[PDB]
Design an enzyme around this catalytic site. Structure first.
Site, PDB file in Angstrom:
ATOM      1  N   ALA A  23      62.985  23.213 -28.049  1.00  0.00           N
ATOM      2  CA  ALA A  23      62.008  22.727 -27.075  1.00  0.00           C
ATOM      3  C   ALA A  23      62.408  23.100 -25.649  1.00  0.00           C
ATOM      4  CB  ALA A  23      61.842  21.221 -27.205  1.00  0.00           C
ATOM      5  N   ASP A  24      61.477  23.696 -24.907  1.00  0.00           N
ATOM      6  CA  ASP A  24      61.728  24.056 -23.511  1.00  0.00           C
ATOM      7  C   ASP A  24      61.356  22.926 -22.548  1.00  0.00           C
ATOM      8  OD1 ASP A  24      58.964  24.177 -22.825  1.00  0.00           O
ATOM      9  OD2 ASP A  24      58.838  26.258 -23.491  1.00  0.00           O
ATOM     10  N   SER A  25      61.375  23.223 -21.251  1.00  0.00           N
ATOM     11  CA  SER A  25      61.178  22.202 -20.222  1.00  0.00           C
ATOM     12  C   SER A  25      59.718  21.766 -20.048  1.00  0.00           C
ATOM     13  CB  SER A  25      61.780  22.650 -18.884  1.00  0.00           C
ATOM     14  OG  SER A  25      61.466  24.000 -18.594  1.00  0.00           O
ATOM     15  N   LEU A  26      58.813  22.397 -20.792  1.00  0.00           N
ATOM     16  CA  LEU A  26      57.438  21.909 -20.914  1.00  0.00           C
ATOM     17  C   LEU A  26      57.238  21.169 -22.233  1.00  0.00           C
ATOM     18  CD1 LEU A  26      54.475  21.793 -19.788  1.00  0.00           C
ATOM     19  CD2 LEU A  26      54.095  23.980 -20.952  1.00  0.00           C
ATOM     20  N   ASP A  27      57.806  21.718 -23.306  1.00  0.00           N
ATOM     21  CA  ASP A  27      57.691  21.140 -24.644  1.00  0.00           C
ATOM     22  C   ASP A  27      58.067  19.662 -24.663  1.00  0.00           C
ATOM     23  OD1 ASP A  27      56.815  23.445 -26.103  1.00  0.00           O
ATOM     24  OD2 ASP A  27      58.872  24.214 -26.093  1.00  0.00           O
TER      25      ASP A  27
END
Ligand code: HEM
Ligand SMILES: CCCCCCCS[C@@H]1O[C@H](CO)[C@@H](O)[C@H](O)[C@H]1O
Lengths: 378, 78
Positions: free
Chosen positions: B37-41
């Site tokens: 998971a990234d910083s938007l996810d």
């Protein structure tokens, strides 16, 4: 809801703790800057870089990300200077001044439509149409396609705000596809038949996609923020009838009045930077990769720069507000925005001698935007 | 067949968000390290969970939750 009515009390509490405040709001952790000196220093410092408002390598909203990532606003060296210089020709002091005739004539035309009605909605009847007509004329968007631009701008502005949702970003991706397809087509026409507009000027180095995203950026900026400046200014003046009489009796005060409107109710409340390395400032250390959020409206209320900062005083001089930002990314269209607001407000006060108020803010945290502004006159 | 449990509802959200199968999501799996998971996810995950379970997670509590079990554990309270 209470934040939207008065964010400045919220800003004050943060400033009292520390002008660079470590915290997290709406699930976004970082440094929230309310201090003027600190804000100016960070915006001046190239070590604090601009960044894409969605993760760099994210393809969840592939078309939205692509459009955003090509904009000069989110580009660093050396692509920033290239993109900015190429677009700057339409916003020089000389070129901006040449827009004045068209702005004056559009203002009078719009006020003609409502002159006999004794009532108007400042945004729908006046502020928006003016800003929309002016920017579409500068870019080179046909009058038939002007309504489509409005929809794209209102949808895409939300994609950068803290208040954005999954639904807003999905809608944003669709509008990104539409806008990019439209401007690519318009670029093809201007390639064959150049006209007296910005698209043609851009085509005269830049890819056709970079030109399209440049047009989209300027279209959004021309709509959203300029509309807010006009409508916020009108509300400000009507809430302070005492320097409204004053500006009405002397239209030459419009310059200093518009600047104080910019300071007092800044259309843009937030911009952002990322630290490209470990940086020491104002007795704190911001580490590489950490996000920095610059609250421009808060900095404009810093009592160490502006005495009695919560007092609206149109004679304030000088007025080194940060509403247009600071440093390399400082607003490109600041002269145009000022000119539109100056002409719109002065003419309105001239033509509606008995202007009175008949309020709700849009759910945006990075921008101070009214939902509507109903007024009565004559 | 049965109605969706708390665990099944959490895992469906994670699966749809991160493009993984609802089976493939294990309880001990870390959102960032394991599930990628990234910083938007992670922001959109919290939003989705807030919506699904009609709850409001403070930023303080969301920072604590880093694994699937911690998300499930939090929802079983609150
Ligand atoms: C038609 C009117 C406008 C146009 C065409 C325009 C255009 C632009 C462009 C192209 C940039 C990017 C410059 C760069 O990255 O080098 C910019 C920056 C900026 N604009 Fe404007 N703008 C307009 C109106 C406004 C208004 C009314 C405000 C608020 C008072 C505003 C606030 C800002 C700020 C704060 C930045 C810098 C943000 C940052 O440093 O991250 N703009 N503008
Ligand atoms: C559900 C949590 C998914 S993951 C969670 O996301 C939070 C909000 O982005 C972060 O604060 C936290 O560090 C991260 O582990």
């Amino acid at each position: 809801s209470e934040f939207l009515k008065n964010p400045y009390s919220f800003y004050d509490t943060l400033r009292a703790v520390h002008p660079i405040y470590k915290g997290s709001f709406l699930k976004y952790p970082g440094w929230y800057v309310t201090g003027y000196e600190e804000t100016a220093a960070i915006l001046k410092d190239a070590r604090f870089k601009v960044r894409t408002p969605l993760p760099e390598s994210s393809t969840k909203y592939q078309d939205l990300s692509h459009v955003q990532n090509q904009m000069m606003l989110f580009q660093n060296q050396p692509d920033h200077r290239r993109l900015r210089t190429l677009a700057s020709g339409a916003f020089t002091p000389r070129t901006t001044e040449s827009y004045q005739p068209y702005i004056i004539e559009t203002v009078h035309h719009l006020l003609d439509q409502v002159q006999g009605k004794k009532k108007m909605e400042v945004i729908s009847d006046f502020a928006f149409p003016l800003a929309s007509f002016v920017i579409a004329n500068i870019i080179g968007v046909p009058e038939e396609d002007r309504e489509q631009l409005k929809e794209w701008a209102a949808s895409l502005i939300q994609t950068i705000d803290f208040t954005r949702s999954r639904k807003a970003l999905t809608e944003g991706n669709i509008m990104a596809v539409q806008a990019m397809a439209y401007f690519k087509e318009l670029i093809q026409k201007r390639k064959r038949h150049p006209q007296q507009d910005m698209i043609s000027m851009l085509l005269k180095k830049l890819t056709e996609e970079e030109a399209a995203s440049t047009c989209i950026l300027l279209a959004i900026a021309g709509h959203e923020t300029t509309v807010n400046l006009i409508s916020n200014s009108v509300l400000c003046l009507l809430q302070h009838p005492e320097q409204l009489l004053k500006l009405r009796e002397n239209p030459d005060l419009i310059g200093t009045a518009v600047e104080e409107c910019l300071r007092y109710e800044s259309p843009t409340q937030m911009t952002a930077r990322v630290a490209s390395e470990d940086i020491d400032i104002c007795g704190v250390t911001i580490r590489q990769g950490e996000q920095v959020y610059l609250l421009l409206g808060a900095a404009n209320r810093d009592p160490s720069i502006f005495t009695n900062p919560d007092v609206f005083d149109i004679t304030r001089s000088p007025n080194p507000h940060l509403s247009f930002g600071h440093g390399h990314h400082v607003c490109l269209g600041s002269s145009l925005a000022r000119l539109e607001a100056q002409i719109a407000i002065n003419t309105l006060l001239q033509r509606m001698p008995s202007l009175n108020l008949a309020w709700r803010y849009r759910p945006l945290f990075g921008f101070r935007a009214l939902e509507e502004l109903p007024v009565t006159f004559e | 067949s049965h109605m969706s449990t708390i665990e099944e509802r959490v895992k469906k959200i994670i699966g749809e968000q991160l493009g993984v199968k609802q089976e493939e999501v294990t309880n001990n799996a870390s959102f960032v390290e394991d599930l990628g998971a990234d910083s938007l996810d992670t922001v959109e995950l919290v939003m989705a969970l807030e919506e699904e379970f009609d709850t409001e997670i403070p930023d303080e509590e969301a920072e604590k939750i880093t694994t699937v079990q911690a998300a499930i554990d939090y929802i079983n309270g609150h």
